[PDB]
Chains A and B, each alone.
Chain A
């Protein structure tokens, strides 16, 4: 077992812990934990609507969403002092850039 893959499992547990416990029984009103995700979705939406500006602009809008959130969450866990570096494995992040 590796602590790094365990950290990725902790990341996916936080991903469960951002929307399921957020959404009180599918309510219209948009509670406080959902307001932040609303702001994130809007600041990525209005960003890439003007960035690539295509007629087919939204077709990579989930991708430009999900490539952000990994770096958004993995730099919220290494912020703990008693932690190991998550995204400071430069082989991994540079290989991600190579893939993209």
Chain B
């Protein structure tokens, strides 16, 4: 029945979270990594 429905909105939100977490949520914590490392190393 809703094979197209679930599949298409799942594809959209999968590629959405791909680009979203990639561009946003991994480097927003990698900034914390590099910041704490650069303060500790001076």
User: Do A and B touch each other in the complex, judged by CB within 8 A?
Assistant: yes
List chain A positions with a Cβ less than 8 A from chain B.
2, 4-5, 8, 11-12, 15, 19, 23, 28, 30, 34, 37-38, 41, 61-63, 65-66, 69-70, 89, 91-92, 95-96
Q: In the complex, what residues of B have CB within 8 A of residue A96's CB?
A: 10, 14
Are B7 and A2 neighbours in the complex by a CB distance under 8 Å?
no
Q: In the complex, what residues of A have CB within 8 A of residue B18's CB?
A: 62-63, 66
In the assembled complex, the Cα of A95 lies from the Cα of B3 at a distance in Å of: 10
Are A4 and B2 neighbours in the complex by a CB distance under 8 Å?
yes
B15 to chain A, nearest CB (A): 10
Count chain B residues whose beta carbon lies closer than 8 angstroms to a beta carbon of A: 24
Give the A-B pair count, Cβ closer than 8 A.
62
In the assembled complex, the Cα of A26 lies from the Cα of B13 at a distance in Å of: 27
Are B13 and A19 neighbours in the complex by a CB distance under 8 Å?
no
Q: In the complex, what residues of A have CB within 8 A of residue B20's CB?
A: 15
Q: In the complex, what residues of B have CB within 8 A of residue A4's CB?
A: 2, 5-6, 9
Question: Can you list 18 pairs linking A and B with CB atoms under 8 Å apart?
Answer: A2-B6, A2-B9, A5-B5, A11-B13, A12-B17, A19-B24, A19-B25, A19-B28, A28-B35, A30-B32, A37-B29, A41-B26, A61-B26, A62-B22, A66-B17, A70-B14, A91-B7, A96-B10
